[PDB]
Amino acid sequence: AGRKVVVVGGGTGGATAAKYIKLADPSIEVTLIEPNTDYYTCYLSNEVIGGDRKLESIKHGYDGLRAHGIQVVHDSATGIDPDKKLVKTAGGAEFGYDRCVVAPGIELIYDKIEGYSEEAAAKLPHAWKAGEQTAILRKQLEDMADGGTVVIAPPAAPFRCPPGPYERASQVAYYLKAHKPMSKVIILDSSQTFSKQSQFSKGWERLYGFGTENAMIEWHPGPDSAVVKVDGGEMMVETAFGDEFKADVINLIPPQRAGKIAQIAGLTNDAGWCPVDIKTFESSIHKGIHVIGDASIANPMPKSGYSANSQGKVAAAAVVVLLKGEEPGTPSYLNTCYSILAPAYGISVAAIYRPNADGSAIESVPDSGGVTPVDAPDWVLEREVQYAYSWYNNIVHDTFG
Amino acid sequence: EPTAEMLTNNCAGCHGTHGNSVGPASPSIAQMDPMVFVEVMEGFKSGEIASTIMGRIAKGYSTADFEKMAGYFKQQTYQPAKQSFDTALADTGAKLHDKYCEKCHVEGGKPLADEEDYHILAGQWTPYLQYAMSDFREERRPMEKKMASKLRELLKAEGDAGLDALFAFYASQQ
Numbered sequence: 042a043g044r045k046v047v048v049v050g051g052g053t054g055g056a057t058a059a060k061y062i063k064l065a066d067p068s069i070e071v072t073l074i075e076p077n078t079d080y081y082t083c084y085l086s087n088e089v090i091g092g093d094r095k096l097e098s099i100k101h102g103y104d105g106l107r108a109h110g111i112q113v114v115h116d117s118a119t120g121i122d123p124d125k126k127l128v129k130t131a132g133g134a135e136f137g138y139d140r141c142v143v144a145p146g147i148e149l150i151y152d153k154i155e156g157y158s159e160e161a162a163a164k165l166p167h168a169w170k171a172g173e174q175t176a177i178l179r180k181q182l183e184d185m186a187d188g189g190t191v192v193i194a195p196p197a198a199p200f201r202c203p204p205g206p207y208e209r210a211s212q213v214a215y216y217l218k219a220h221k222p223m224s225k226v227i228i229l230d231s232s233q234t235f236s237k238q239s240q241f242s243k244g245w246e247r248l249y250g251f252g253t254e255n256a257m258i259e260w261h262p263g264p265d266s267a268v269v270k271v272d273g274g275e276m277m278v279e280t281a282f283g284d285e286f287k288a289d290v291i292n293l294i295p296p297q298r299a300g301k302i303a304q305i306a307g308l309t310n311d312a313g314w315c316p317v318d319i320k321t322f323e324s325s326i327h328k329g330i331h332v333i334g335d336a337s338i339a340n341p342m343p344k345s346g347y348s349a350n351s352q353g354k355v356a357a358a359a360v361v362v363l364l365k366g367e368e369p370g371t372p373s374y375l376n377t378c379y380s381i382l383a384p385a386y387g388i389s390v391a392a393i394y395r396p397n398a399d400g401s402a403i404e405s406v407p408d409s410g411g412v413t414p415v416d417a418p419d420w421v422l423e424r425e426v427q428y429a430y431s432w433y434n435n436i437v438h439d440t441f442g
Numbered sequence: 443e444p445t446a447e448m449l450t451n452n453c454a455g456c457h458g459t460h461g462n463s464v465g466p467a468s469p470s471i472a473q474m475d476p477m478v479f480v481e482v483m484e485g486f487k488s489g490e491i492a493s494t495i496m497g498r499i500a501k502g503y504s505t506a507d508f509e510k511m512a513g514y515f516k517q518q519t520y521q522p523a524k525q526s527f528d529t530a531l532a533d534t535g536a537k538l539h540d541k542y543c544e545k546c547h548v549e550g551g552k553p554l555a556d557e558e559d560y561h562i563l564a565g566q567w568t569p570y571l572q573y574a575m576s577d578f579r580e581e582r583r584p585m586e587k588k589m590a591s592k593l594r595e596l597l598k599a600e601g602d603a604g605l606d607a608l609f610a611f612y613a614s615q616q
């Protein structure tokens with residue numbers, strides 16, 4: 042019917058819910074509010090940083106879904122307050138919505154590491170949103186002195202695509218070899234264990250040295266080594282156990298939470314992530330808004346691009362049929378995060394989820410999913426890189442379309 | 443239980459919206475014989491067909507879901523993967539295909555929706571098919587005894603140049 046659904050945010054999650062909604066029943070005018078021109082991906086940016094992928098490759102327009110019956114008004118949302126179902130944006134526009142899909146991403150919390158700021162980002166970069174940021178870090182790695190040390194500092198708790206820091210360390214290490222088995226990646230982490238750890242370690246052993254300590258990657262555990270609340274353009278970071286690591290390129294990855302607009306609107310809870318209903322992704326706080334995967338609390342679904350896409354669908358379907366018809370049904374969601382470690386070595390973790398029993402509770406269907414077995418043969422590791430690319434090419438087409 | 447389309451939504455990530463994979467290596471699974479689909483899918487599940495990940499994926503679904511799903515993929519239209527084939531070889535492929543594969547690989551191995559049974563090979567992504575054969579020649583995948591013979595002894599009267607020629611020919615069929 043002639044409905045307006047407003048989708049705030051037009052990245053993986055937002056875009057997926059936008060097109061699939063228009064797609065699902067073309068009489069609904071779907072407006073997609075997004076501050077900017079281009080979507081730079083981040084799910085394969087570390088390959089730009091490693092040097093094999095041009096930054097051009099991960100830039101993507103809205104022309105696709107736009108020319109698909111979606112009005113892409115480039116503007117930042119500013120407020121949203123329900124009751125009288127309006128959405129306001131930094132320049133004077135208020136769009137009425139019958140239902141709204143908020144998909145803002147991660148707000149990074151600079152504060153948490155005293156020394157770091159919004160303006161420190163430009164010199165010591167978290168490339169955890171991509172574009173410009175990925176380029177800074179690439180310039181710094183191209184600019185590093187052979188011998189130069191790079192440190193990478195994972196937050197902990199919930200962050201976006203967990204193997205991210207370690208695939209970055211692999212990609213970086215992959216490059217550094219350009220500067221002679223003479224350089225070093227140092228990861229100062231906030232956690233005891235980590236995602237696809239044994240496969241990551243086996244990989245590192247195999248490629249960049251690792252037990253050898255005539256090795257190019259060093260992993261330093263956590264909470265101790267959690268790079269806290271100090272770093273400075275003296276080019277030093279200081280962990281929570283007070284050691285000082287001086288390094289030529291440091292990449293601080295700050296703690297994250299639901300994007301800002303989710304906080305203005307009232308969608309976050311105690312943790313600073315938005316509570317959603319697992320069947321339809323409608324907010325358990327304000328009705329008529331659906332928040333998707335990053336900014337939402339989705340039981341073990343890792344905060345990833347894939348998860349965003351899936352949820353996007355469950356959302357798209359959930360609203361459109363709920364919007365103007367009847368009772369939506371049950372869903373299945375899926376995730377797999379891929380990590381390429383060297384052009385020929387790739388691993389993956391994959392999982393299938395289902396509304397476990399009844400109500401809110403997403404639980405992986407038992408006996409399924411997993412990550413590339415550690416005893417994987419050459420062909421698996423070699424093939425997976427190609428299936429990683431394929432996953433990329435396909436998901437950025439499924440999504441903007 | 444979810445609709446076929448709910449379950450099939452979540453595969454778009456790796457082999458295209460509707461099963462038609464964009465580059466460079468995932469298989470398109472759009473027009474797929476629903477019978478071949480549960481065989482393969484349940485094979486992946488059991489481990490008998492060597493996968494890099496589909497055994498992990500497959501193991502979370504069960505036969506009826508493979509049926510809802512094959513029901514869902516059967517109605518799509520397959521789209522040939524536009525990729526580069528060899529001209530000089532495109533030809534020789536055809537010839538060799540008749541003489542060794544044509545028995546079961548229906549009219550260039552195309553997705554003929556000719557009611558039942560067929561193995562789609564025209565317009566499928568070359569890297570995949572190259573891998574496909576590797577799992578065969580190496581005995582990672584169950585291979586039917588005639589499928590073998592023609593490949594295993596006969597095709598190899600041409601040697602690897604043979605397979606090259608076949609790979610170029612299925613790719614010309616766009």
Ligand SMILES: *Cc1cc2c(cc1C)nc1c(=O)[nH]c(=O)nc-1n2C[C@@H](O)[C@@H](O)[C@@H](O)COP(=O)(O)OP(=O)(O)OC[C@H]1O[C@@H](n2cnc3c(N)ncnc32)[C@H](O)[C@@H]1O
Nearest residue numbers: 050052053054083084118145146169202302335345346347
């Ligand atoms: C950065 C990173 C993340 C990764 C990753 C590696 C890195 C280095 N690797 C991944 C991988 O291999 N596989 C994956 O499946 N994902 C990976 N990811 C995860 C990550 O990229 C995804 O989680 C993420 O892109 C998708 O999450 P999302 O859909 O929730 O959000 P987004 O960042 O994609 O876009 C949100 C969108 O919202 C816009 N926006 C913000 N605030 C507003 C307002 N006020 N109004 C309107 N628009 C607004 C924002 O600009 C952004 O485009």
Ligand code: HEC
Nearest residue numbers: 377428449452453455456469471482483493494495496499
């Ligand atoms: C990426 C993480 C995948 C997801 C999610 C799904 N599939 Fe998949 N599929 C993928 C690859 C890389 C391959 C090759 C096999 C391997 O693991 O090495 C495939 C292949 C298939 C096939 C076989 C097609 C053929 O030509 O023989 C089928 C039947 C298939 N995939 C089905 C399928 C379905 C129904 C999924 C959604 C639930 C699904 N796949 C997800 C990678 C990925």
Ligand code: HEC
Nearest residue numbers: 542543545546561571574584585586588589592593597608
């Ligand atoms: C008749 C029996 C044959 C012959 C003469 C050939 N093939 Fe094909 N093939 C056949 C079957 C029943 C199957 C399924 C697997 C099984 O044996 O259980 C296949 C499958 C393929 C595939 C893989 C398809 C996929 O899953 O994507 C390929 C790539 C393939 N066959 C190729 C092929 C070629 C090149 C042949 C001529 C030398 C050939 N086959 C012969 C059955 C038969």
